[PDB]
Design a protein around this ligand. Structure first.
Ligand SMILES: CC(C)(C)OC(=O)N[C@@H](Cc1ccc(O)cc1)C(=O)O
Ligand SMILES: CC(C)=CCSP(=O)(O)OP(=O)(O)O
Ligand SMILES: [Mg+2]
Length: 297
């Protein structure tokens, strides 16, 4: 048992370290209210992963973006949901804002089967403009067509984007501090399906050739269906973060993030998100970079 208390304290400090390393590299001052997220991730004593992310818009660097993934093998998804919602409610209380939950509420509405959840995340994207700050939640469902339909109904709605409805498993919620809220649905293609002829016909055919090149180094591909019908954001799960510069033409701000993380003590994979048209450019100006670390007993 003494092994357990020592390892719990150590995990608590390693999560805070991962968060501070990211914040201190990109923001001289922490963005308020980061310490509420720090308290939340330290209260999650089961196994988890953390995500630290940068959104780059030309030379603007948005870096107070963090996410916890619940990975306790007991899979008490409903308990994790409740722990995330009470953290959101603490943000509301301390900041003095009211979050608009209606989209999450309607998605969960008609008696939710939590056994169909395979991923749950909770986190933040904090800005000095409070109204532009947001809380975040992702839910991945499996073999749950009733809730797939409900998420589609909740976003912009039917076609198009409906052309990729059968590829959807991940649902994203954003909760802005001004009371605006959004839902997003993500179509995915797994590595083992990359070369199948039906996949080229149903998916790749609708994307420029440049969109296909980073699949060579990716184990997974996502795209958001409802935001930006024009110019959809494309997400690539790079097997090795070192391949980023080989497949994506980085500007100066993104290169600074990449250089910082090349030799950090983190997981080897990353996610890269970029709008479809950025890949047709000679140089990406808008890109989102996501890095990860795991925290296990
Ligand atoms: C655990 C498995 C099934 C391998 O992951 C998923 O396909 N879901 C993604 C979805 C996701 C990725 C990044 C995010 O920031 C949010 C959600 C994931 O969790 O890795
Ligand atoms: C698509 C998965 C792989 C990455 C997380 S996407 P997000 O919607 O939470 O981040 P953005 O809203 O695109 O900035
Ligand atoms: Mg989004």
């Amino acid at each position: 048992m003494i092994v357990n208390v020592i390892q719990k304290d150590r995990l608590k400090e390693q999560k805070l370290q991962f968060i501070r390393n990211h914040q201190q590299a990109f923001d001289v001052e922490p963005i308020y209210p980061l310490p509420l997220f720090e308290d939340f991730v330290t209260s999650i004593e089961g196994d988890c992963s953390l995500e630290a992310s940068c959104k780059i818009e030309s030379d603007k660097l948005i870096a107070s973006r963090f996410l916890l993934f619940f990975e306790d093998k007991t899979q008490e998804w409903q308990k994790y949901l409740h722990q995330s919602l009470t953290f959101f409610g603490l943000v509301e209380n301390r900041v003095g804002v009211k979050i608009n939950y209606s989209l999450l509420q309607q998605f969960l509405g008609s008696s939710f089967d939590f056994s169909k959840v395979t991923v749950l995340s909770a986190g933040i994207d904090l800005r000095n403009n409070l109204a532009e700050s947001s809380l975040k939640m992702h839910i991945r469902i499996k073999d749950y067509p009733e809730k797939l339909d409900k998420a589609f109904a909740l976003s912009d709605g039917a076609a198009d984007g409906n052309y990729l409805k059968d590829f959807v498993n991940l649902i994203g919620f954003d909760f802005y501090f001004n009371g605006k809220s959004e839902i997003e649905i993500y179509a995915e293609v797994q590595e083992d399906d990359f070369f199948k002829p039906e996949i080229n016909n149903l998916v790749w055919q609708h994307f420029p050739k440049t969109a296909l090149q980073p699949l060579k180094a990716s184990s997974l591909f996502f795209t958001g269906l409802s935001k930006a019908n024009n110019n959809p954001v494309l997400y690539y799960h790079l097997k090795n973060r070192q391949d980023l510069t080989n497949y994506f033409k980085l500007n100066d701000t993104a290169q600074r993030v990449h250089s910082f993380y090349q030799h950090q003590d983190i997981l080897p994979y990353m996610w890269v998100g970029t709008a479809q048209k950025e890949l047709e450019k000679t140089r990406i100006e808008n890109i989102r970079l996501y890095y990860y670390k795991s925290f296990k007993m």
